[PDB]
């Protein structure tokens, strides 16, 4: 019932300073704790009691609390700082977390590096046939894949998944998997996947022939 209002995103240039707000109703007389959760990991305490810092946490991480707003302040932000952040109080015998703030770090545009992969022998031998396309290390995050089979766009059996902002170079990556049966895969010759992205007027296209 006590609410904590964080923004969903904060965005900062590398080397510059990020400020994440924890809007709380007279929060300034409460003790405020902050957590960092990188993709794949468990939360880590980074600031306790408004402004105290556990040993191990860089000095770049700093906290403050007054009025209706507590603030985590990360200065000289690097790509390693990309994470979801949470603030935490007690109120009336309960613990409360604000929704996550995702910190994204800025960087320069980058065109996707695109690669295509025919089914494996193991998979043909099992009766399956997956064509995989990686669209890697691009920025900004928005991207699109198109699959053509022998010239015509196909939409079914396509599976997509995106990475979180990369921890070292601040880019984004995408996997695309078109899955058919060994039979259906062999009723055709031309497999094509094409990447459309801000950094280009024309789509980046990779392709192969079952023949070779």
């Amino acid at each position: 019932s006590y609410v904590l209002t964080q923004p969903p995103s904060v965005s900062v240039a590398p080397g510059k300073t990020a400020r994440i707000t924890c809007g709380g109703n007279n929060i300034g007389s409460k003790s405020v704790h902050w957590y960092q959760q990188k993709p794949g990991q468990a939360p880590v305490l980074v600031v306790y009691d408004d402004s105290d810092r556990p040993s191990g946490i860089p000095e770049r991480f700093s906290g403050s609390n007054s009025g209706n707003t507590a603030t985590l302040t990360i200065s000289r932000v690097e790509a390693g700082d990309e994470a979801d952040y949470y603030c935490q109080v007690w109120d009336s015998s309960s613990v409360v977390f604000g929704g996550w703030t995702k910190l994204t770090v800025l960087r320069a545009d980058a065109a996707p590096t695109v690669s295509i992969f025919p089914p494996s022998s193991e998979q043909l031998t099992s009766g399956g046939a997956s064509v995989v396309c990686f669209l890697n290390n691009f920025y900004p995050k928005d991207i699109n894949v198109k699959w053509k089979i022998d010239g015509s766009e196909r939409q079914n059996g396509v599976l997509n998944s995106w990475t979180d902002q990369d921890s070292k170079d601040s880019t984004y990556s995408m996997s695309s998997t078109l899955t058919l049966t060994k039979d259906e895969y062999e009723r055709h010759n031309s497999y094509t996947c094409e990447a459309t992205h801000k950094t280009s007027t024309s789509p980046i296209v990779k392709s192969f022939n079952r023949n070779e």
């Binding site: 193991e122 990686f134 890697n136």
Partner: protein
């Protein structure tokens, strides 16, 4: 050095219940607050409750409908969370965390236990190498991990010694079977002159598989 460790990923039918363990490896849970914090896929942390063993007092959040039961062991070394009448919204990662009794924060955290509420049956993964079709100056390789249930799989390249240049993608569910993929980018001067191996572990089915690319 003191470490919270939780029991392994869990799968439970709709309607049943799950119990999860939290052990203070080489430590203690006296003089401490232990707390359980769940996280729905791609959603935020939510407090389920917390239990002080010395004051022998448990506390719970609303929104659980009296569904949570938090306890602790007589050795006072191990903590338990119990969730009854599981619905598909209970699919979550469940963390425990410990903090000082005098203070309000949690500086120690378990690795989390994935609980998946489903009727689907366990299935070991198929692991396919992705090799460069038919050379440039940098080359991308990959593994395709297909047809498994439940989560998680753990993927590494070269038993962990290769982690630079890696993109491991979030698993995606299609018709109760997951799919995972991962690419590693190396410089051609490297491949195939050196093994680059995909390692996939899937504890639910007790499978470890290696695939040289």
């Amino acid at each position: 050095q003191v470490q919270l460790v939780q029991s392994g990923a869990e799968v439970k039918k709709p309607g049943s219940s799950v119990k999860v363990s939290c052990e203070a490896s080489g430590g203690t849970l006296s003089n401490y607050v232990i707390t359980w914090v769940r996280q729905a896929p791609g959603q935020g942390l939510e407090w389920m409750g917390g239990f002080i063993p010395t004051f022998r007092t448990a506390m719970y959040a609303q929104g659980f409908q009296g569904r949570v039961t938090i306890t602790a062991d007589e050795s006072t070394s191990i903590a338990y969370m119990e969730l009854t009448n599981l619905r598909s919204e209970d699919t979550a990662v469940y963390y425990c965390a410990r903090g000082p009794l005098s203070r309000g924060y949690y500086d120690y955290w378990g690795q989390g236990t994935l609980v998946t509420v489903s009727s689907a049956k366990t299935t070991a993964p198929s692991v396919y190498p992705l090799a460069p079709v038919c050379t440039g100056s940098s080359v991308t390789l990959g593994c395709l991990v297909k047809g498994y249930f439940p989560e998680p799989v753990t993927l590494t390249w070269n038993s962990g010694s290769l982690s630079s240049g890696v993109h491991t993608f979030p698993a995606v569910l299609q018709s109760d079977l997951y799919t995972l993929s991962s690419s590693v980018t190396v410089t051609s001067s490297t491949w195939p002159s050196q093994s680059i191996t995909c390692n996939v572990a899937h504890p639910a089915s007790s499978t470890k598989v290696d695939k040289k690319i």
